[PDB]
């Protein structure tokens, strides 16, 4: 089932780049975080100061696809970075918190 999860992940990755290529530039106002593939999920252009969220993916057997992933776009329009390694980091912790 890990072979299938990886395949799902690679399909989503390809689909994410297609989506990011085809959608017009951001139409909103003020600072914002850029659309991005984070490694597991696609995120759209997001206004500064918004905590975006979407369903957990089903790539992994301990992930609950009915839980939510969050990703914080800070008030300068910069995606949250994990303080441990200073790289952009989405919050998947609830995906397998209660397994």
């Amino acid at each position: 089932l890990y072979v299938v999860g990886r395949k799902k992940m690679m399909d989503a990755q390809y689909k994410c780049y297609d989506r990011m290529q085809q959608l017009p530039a951001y139409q909103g106002e003020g600072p914002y975080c850029n659309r991005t593939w984070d490694g597991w999920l696609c995120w759209d252009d997001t206004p500064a100061g918004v905590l975006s969220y979407q369903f957990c993916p089903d790539y992994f057997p301990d992930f609950d696809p009915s839980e939510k992933v969050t990703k914080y776009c800070d008030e300068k329009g910069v995606w949250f970075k994990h303080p441990e390694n200073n790289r952009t980091w989405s919050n998947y912790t609830m995906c397998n918190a209660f397994t």
């Binding site: 490694g39 999920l41 301990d62 994990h82 441990e84 390694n85 980091w89 998947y92 397998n96 397994t99």
Partner: peptide
């Protein structure tokens, strides 16, 4: 039951 997926630093 399965191995636990890492969601910490160095993951997406």
């Amino acid at each position: 039951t399965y191995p636990r997926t890492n969601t910490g630093s160095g993951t997406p």
